[PDB]
Amino acid sequence: IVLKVLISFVQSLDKNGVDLLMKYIYKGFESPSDNSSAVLLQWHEKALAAGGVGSIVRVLTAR
Amino acid sequence: QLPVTRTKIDWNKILSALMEVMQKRSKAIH
Amino acid sequence: DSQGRKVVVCDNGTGFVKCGYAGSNFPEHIFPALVGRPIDLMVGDEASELRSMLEVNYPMENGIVRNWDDMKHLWDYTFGPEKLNIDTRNCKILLTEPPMNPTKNREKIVEVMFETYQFSGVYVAIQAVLTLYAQGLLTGVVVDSGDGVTHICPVYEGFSLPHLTRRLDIAGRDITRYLIKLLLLRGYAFNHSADFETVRMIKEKLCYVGYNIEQEQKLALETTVLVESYTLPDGRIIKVGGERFEAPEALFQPHLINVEGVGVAELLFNTIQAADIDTRSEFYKHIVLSGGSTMYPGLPSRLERELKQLYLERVLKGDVEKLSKFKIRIEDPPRRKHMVFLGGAVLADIMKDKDNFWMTRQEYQEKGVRVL
Amino acid sequence: SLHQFLLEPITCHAWNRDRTQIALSPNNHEVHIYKKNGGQWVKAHELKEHNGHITGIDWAPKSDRIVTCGADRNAYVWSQKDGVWKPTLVILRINRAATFVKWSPLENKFAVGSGARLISVCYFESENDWWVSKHIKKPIRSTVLSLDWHPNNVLLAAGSCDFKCRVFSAYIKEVDEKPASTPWGSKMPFGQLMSEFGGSGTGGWVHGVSFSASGSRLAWVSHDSTVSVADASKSVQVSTLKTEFLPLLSVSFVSENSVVAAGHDCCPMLFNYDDRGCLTFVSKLDIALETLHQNSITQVSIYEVDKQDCRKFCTTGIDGAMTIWDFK
Ligand SMILES: Nc1ncnc2c1ncn2[C@@H]1O[C@H](COP(=O)(O)OP(=O)(O)OP(=O)(O)O)[C@@H](O)[C@H]1O
Ligand SMILES: [Mg+2]
Numbered sequence A: 001i002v003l004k005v006l007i008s009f010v011q012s013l014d015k016n017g018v019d020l021l022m023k024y025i026y027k028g029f030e031s032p033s034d035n036s037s038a039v040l041l042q043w044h045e046k047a048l049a050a051g052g053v054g055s056i057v058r059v060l061t062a063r
Numbered sequence B: 001q002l003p004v005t006r007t008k009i010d011w012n013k014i015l016s017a018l019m020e021v022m023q024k025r026s027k028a029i030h
Numbered sequence C: 001d002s003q004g005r006k007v008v009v010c011d012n013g014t015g016f017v018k019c020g021y022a023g024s025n026f027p028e029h030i031f032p033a034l035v036g037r038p039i040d041l042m043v044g045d046e047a048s049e050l051r052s053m054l055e056v057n058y059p060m061e062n063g064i065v066r067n068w069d070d071m072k073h074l075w076d077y078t079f080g081p082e083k084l085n086i087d088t089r090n091c092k093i094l095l096t097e098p099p100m101n102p103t104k105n106r107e108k109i110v111e112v113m114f115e116t117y118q119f120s121g122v123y124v125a126i127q128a129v130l131t132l133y134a135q136g137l138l139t140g141v142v143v144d145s146g147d148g149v150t151h152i153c154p155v156y157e158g159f160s161l162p163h164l165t166r167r168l169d170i171a172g173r174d175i176t177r178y179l180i181k182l183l184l185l186r187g188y189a190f191n192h193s194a195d196f197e198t199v200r201m202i203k204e205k206l207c208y209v210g211y212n213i214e215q216e217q218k219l220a221l222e223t224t225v226l227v228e229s230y231t232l233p234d235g236r237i238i239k240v241g242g243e244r245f246e247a248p249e250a251l252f253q254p255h256l257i258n259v260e261g262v263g264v265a266e267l268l269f270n271t272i273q274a275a276d277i278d279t280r281s282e283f284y285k286h287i288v289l290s291g292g293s294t295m296y297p298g299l300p301s302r303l304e305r306e307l308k309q310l311y312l313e314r315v316l317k318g319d320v321e322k323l324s325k326f327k328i329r330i331e332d333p334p335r336r337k338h339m340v341f342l343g344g345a346v347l348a349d350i351m352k353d354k355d356n357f358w359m360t361r362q363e364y365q366e367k368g369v370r371v372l
Numbered sequence D: 001s002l003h004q005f006l007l008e009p010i011t012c013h014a015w016n017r018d019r020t021q022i023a024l025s026p027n028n029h030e031v032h033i034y035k036k037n038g039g040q041w042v043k044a045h046e047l048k049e050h051n052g053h054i055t056g057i058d059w060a061p062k063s064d065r066i067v068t069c070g071a072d073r074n075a076y077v078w079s080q081k082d083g084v085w086k087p088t089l090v091i092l093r094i095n096r097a098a099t100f101v102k103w104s105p106l107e108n109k110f111a112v113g114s115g116a117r118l119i120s121v122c123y124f125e126s127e128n129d130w131w132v133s134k135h136i137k138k139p140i141r142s143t144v145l146s147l148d149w150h151p152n153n154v155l156l157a158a159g160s161c162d163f164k165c166r167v168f169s170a171y172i173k174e175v176d177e178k179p180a181s182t183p184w185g186s187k188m189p190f191g192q193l194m195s196e197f198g199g200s201g202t203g204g205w206v207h208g209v210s211f212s213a214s215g216s217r218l219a220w221v222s223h224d225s226t227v228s229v230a231d232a233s234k235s236v237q238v239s240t241l242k243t244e245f246l247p248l249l250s251v252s253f254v255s256e257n258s259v260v261a262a263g264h265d266c267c268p269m270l271f272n273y274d275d276r277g278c279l280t281f282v283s284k285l286d287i288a289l290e291t292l293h294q295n296s297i298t299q300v301s302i303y304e305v306d307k308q309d310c311r312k313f314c315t316t317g318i319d320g321a322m323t324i325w326d327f328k
Helices: A003-008 A017-028 A036-051 A054-060 B011-015 B018-029 C071-078 C103-116 C127-133 C172-184 C196-205 C213-222 C263-272 C277-284 C299-310 C339-350 C361-366
Strands: C007-011 C016-021 C029-032 C035-037 C055-057 C092-097 C121-126 C140-144 C150-155 C166-168 C228-231 C237-240 C287-290 D002-004 D013-015 D022-024 D031-036 D041-047 D054-060 D065-070 D075-080 D085-089 D098-103 D109-114 D118-125 D130-136 D144-149 D155-160 D164-169 D193-197 D206-211 D217-222 D226-231 D237-242 D248-253 D258-263 D269-273 D279-284 D297-302 D312-317 D321-326
Touching (some): B018 C339, C007 C339, C016 C339, C103 C121, C121 C127, C166 C263, C287 C339, D013 D297, D098 D144, D164 D206, D164 D217
Parallel strands (some): C092 C121, C140 C287
Antiparallel strands (some): D002 D321, D013 D022, D065 D075, D075 D085, D144 D155, D226 D237, D258 D269, D269 D279
16 A cells, blocks of 8 residues: 555665565556556566565465 | 075085285285 | 296286296286288287288187187297297196186197197186285285276185176277277378277377366367377377377277277176175275276276265265265276286295196096096 | 486486496486496496386495386386396385485485375385385375485485475384484384474475485475575574575585585575574576576486585486586
């Protein structure tokens, strides 16, 4: 629900909150609203460099 | 009426150890 | 030999002959039982790689000897200087005898073996007993298949029950023939005679029995993960798709290739539910599968479901609580093909020394018959 | 140093004592034995008894015997008594497909991991000349994918698809002699759960497990791109590191402090474990793709004399290439 403030806009880089940001980003793609998709896609590339390709697995096996 | 074998009893073989050895096979396989 | 360590046991079949010594857990030699003449005599393995340029003949059918001029030439190849190298004068033999064989044939093989070969010991054994001797049991039910017909035979302690033996007239030959008919409806023409052994490799490599037909058809209609490519000796590549799980189902539904009956699953039920009430539980727990035509994937896991459903709507109608107390179990070790041989590898080992198991040569010098 | 045997994948590979012969399985129902005649690999023997996909091989060096297991629910023990290898039969009593096999340090038992929620420990009997099995099945809920043995020939590590890594005891009283006391525990009956791990919330399938030379440390890799080391000397404690790379498919100890791993990134890596309980990444070891292997690495083994003194290690995988890597 704070993803709107994120839409209006790496930060902490705790090496464990990157997984939480990845989870929020991939859960936000299910409900596009004509402007959130572009900014979320733009931050996906930024977060990928800081976190890594491994982080995509953590959200994929989060269950 | 008839025995379990469903046949006349064979008197020749009645008139006239595998089971000991087969127990180890029965134990090992099952 | 003097101490008795030259006993040889051989299983004779319509498709394959399996010969070896006692005390070994493996066959010494396997070879197909083909004898043929060109269009002098090519017998044994040589009649397999080349058969388009050769006229073949099968000298047996469910134990019945078709011609008594070709089995001698096959047995010379078995007991000859290319496979076993035996000195025939000093040996004893253990043979198989399929269920429900006529008397004349039983005493013709015994008669011809003592005369033209001069062995020193002969015994003939029922295959149902031998299959369970290799499993450690004594009372059970054998469901044997192959290239002849599928027999279901019970057996009590040591002695079979010929009254309660049932047979079904479909085997590997009918399934590999039906696969030719199915493959004919894709643009692939295989003639009946010269390409029989080319489609058999396709059957052996890519065929399986489905557990639930519904998911099989769903994957066959909406997905392409069942189609596989097979290479041929000519160099062509053919594609086999949904035909994998249609050919093996002549066993469970016999009317698809014009055979009147009930199928293997229901025939097993009709055989177990025909004996005295006390011994019926003794047969439910111990059912053994034998033969090469029961190595399809899933055939173990389908008969259990069919028997459980056939026993929950015919005997115990409704009331689904007591099936847990009703224990049913099917035994099928990954050594199903040679269980006739392995049993013969045990019975010749235990009774190697005492000289009453064998039929002595001197018995036929005076009497000419046997009572054992 | 790369060598390409065949274009097909290599399911599994086994070495012998002198590192002269190699046993391979090129994704079929056969096993090929190769030797080295000078400076070129030429095939030597073929072993063919299975009728299904072969999934695991191992080579007992001191006894010089090859155990083979596959997806046809079979296992065979191959021995060389004449010029031609011959098999011996193993009774396993499983109804699903086997997945892994491994010899013991003393070469008297071997452990088979299968998909029927079982672990089969098999030992030899000579009155009728075959191998007979015992089953461990109590706490397992899914298929086992990895196995390892302790130096003291009793304990047994296992990883399974139910997101757990377990340590059992496999003491067979007919064959083995009484063991000593370990930090892992004291009371060791057959089939008794000695320890269990796997609590991390987002756990994935464990693909590889391994013990250290001292025997008091365990290491395992998971499908959530994590490696973990469990210590039992000071206390039963864990330390898990969350790597930022693809999943890892094998693990092996090089020493008490360093552990080498490999996986789908096609490049082996080295991790360090401090005595205080911390895992830290060190470096890769391989500084078309910019990597010698062209596909995922499936197996990592030691070319040298194992964990007492390890210098070189061997990698093989789906690309069909086998590579020897030297630290120096
Ligand atoms: N894995 C397999 N899958 C399917 N079919 C197989 C498989 N292995 C063998 N077969 C088939 O099983 C048959 C082999 O029969 P088998 O060797 O058991 O003969 P047999 O018992 O001596 O014969 P019979 O009793 O009819 O004289 C052949 O049709 C062969 O194609
Ligand atoms: Mg037969």
